[PDB]
């Protein structure tokens, strides 16, 4: 396998399905990345993450640099070895957790800058490295959005140069740039233009899911995604709810990460094709059905709603484990249905059918 | 398989190795039972419990009756179905958690008595049912020890009769009686005599590990175990540390349960053949070795001390999972080495070698 190759196998409107080939494996797009905060997808062994269908997971640069430490992980062999996940890993850059000077930022639990962020991602042994950016809070005035976007584009060039100057990283990993500009079309365009002039392996749409709500997010995606190079992956960071994913794919997004399936699983929320359920609710106390009637996951093959209800109410670790496994499996099944429907030219109908039942 | 059959395959001194055949499976003795408090061996799926070598697990009557409820579990199909463990389950009776009238006891989180305890164990679908007893606090005066023992023997007969009057339970489960009498040889003998006159499928030594310490516990086992019927299993409830298990087997015990491997795993203590380690200690922060150098468990095949150190310090659920799996696997490997050494007539040497290295 090459360092990086993205191929589109089929299209429907703005939606695409295809593959990213990297040295540690192939990633089927559109892809959902389970989030490994501190070198673990919470409550799951890596084999279990893989069994659900995940091709790639996300690691958080900010958190890993605080504990256990980036240099410590490198000394121990890198993140893949440390946590026992041998497939691709994408690492975010830290600009979200940060949300200061033109050089970068210092904070108390440390320093982050374009150079230091790329270096930490190198120390971890990341396959997909994200450029270090400045993330504008929503809402943002035009002036502030422009200033943060301009800074982010200067930092994208510094990110690019830091990555390239590290031969081992440049030869074996990929680097993605991050579009900014808040909700403003002209800034989004300036940003896209700047990123494409520098050139990246992939392009994230940054700055959304920051409080603007789905309508506004979709409106911004409507004009922002066509500004990115068509022949590279489009990554929407920190999204999201199933309906957010479907609608973002309808608008050209190829990759996703979110803590929702994991976090909400631990809290008692299970995803189903008829919408999420609150497993702690009394209505589930003697319900022998699985979490979801169609789900192929091991949890739904083996345990009832009633049992998982008990586990979560009791604070048992196995409750977290089962909820999380199901939720991640559900998310992967969603992505698989999206991939198959696009390849078969029936994604429009899938989205319609999905929504009518999920929000019945 | 029969309802119940215990066969001794080999002996060395007072130590025995053999099998208990029951309808849901065979139990290799000497046996360690992982404890499932509230319908879960904490942090482990039942398949993982089985993969470690466990033949049987313990369920806590007291806790299950409080949450989720005994009648609720019966309505849902019984404990095996509820939690997804299809092999034998032993349930304790509640007399430990209780530690009042001659009829039984009422308390606030409910009622327990010989009849109600046997009924709850029936509702759960237990394979090995324990008689309901009264457990004397240590230390106990001779007079108090005698009174509690006498009461326990009256309650053993009531337990026996309740079990027998329930045809389904009598035909498919086994009933074990519990010897009491504190540290007093004459009371222990009276108790053994009373239990054997009633007749049970197995005999537990109750009332120990209550603060008397290992020396005293071993002294009491020295005279108490020979009082029990030789041809039935001998169960030491709530024991224990590896060296406690070895010494109890040297004195004729065939079965064990304890929360130590699970509880102490979650807290950061890993068992090793050179003794327990505190994985949170700084000395493990960059240690690439497995938890134990010889352990065959999946955790030690795959992850380092350093990683598990990180997980436990971070409060991650996977830390609990890995620690627990290892500790239960260690305990099963201990039991396997005990079984093999007795069968091969080299258990004396094993015990000696085990102790010299574990306490080096
Ligand atoms: N949801 C927006 C977002 C999530 N994670 C992010 N990480 C970075 N560097 N930048 C961003 O804009 C975002
Ligand atoms: N360690 C003593 C002990 C543990 N669990 C027990 N359960 C019962 N019924 N009786 C007992 O004496 C004990
Ligand atoms: Zn499922
Ligand atoms: Zn191990």
Residue numbers in the entry:
A (entry chain A), B (entry chain A): 11 to 109, 117 to 126, 133 to 383
From the paper:
Transfer RNA–guanine transglycosylase (Tgt, EC 2.4.2.29) catalyses the exchange of a specific guanine base in tRNA molecules by a substituted 7-deazaguanine. Bacterial Tgt functions as a homodimer in which the protomer consists of a (βα)8 barrel harbouring a Zn2+ binding subdomain close to the C-terminus. The reaction follows a ping-pong mechanism including a covalent Tgt⋅tRNA intermediate. Hence, in an attempt to generate a model system for the active site of human Tgt and to gain insights into the relevance of particular amino acids for substrate base selectivity, we adapted the Z. mobilis Tgt active site by site-directed mutagenesis in order to mimic that of the human enzyme.
Comparison of the active centre of Z. mobilis Tgt with the modelled human Tgt catalytic subunit reveals that Ala232 adjacent to Val233 in the bacterial enzyme is replaced by a serine (Ser231) in human Tgt. As this residue is replaced by a serine in many bacterial Tgts too, it seems unlikely that it contributes to substrate specificity or catalytic activity. Nevertheless, we introduced the Ala232Ser mutation into Tgt(Cys158Val/Val233Gly) to investigate its impact. Kinetic measurements showed that the Ala232Ser conversion further reduced the catalytic activity of Tgt(Cys158Val/Ala232Ser/Val233Gly). Therefore, the Ala232Ser variants of Tgt were not considered further in this study. In addition, crystal structures that were determined of Tgt(Cys158Val/Ala232Ser/Val233Gly) in its apo-form, in complex with preQ1 and in complex with queuine do not show any significant differences to the corresponding ones of Tgt(Cys158Val/Val233Gly) and, due to redundance, will not be discussed in detail (data statistics and PDB codes of these structures are provided in Table S2 of the Supporting Information).
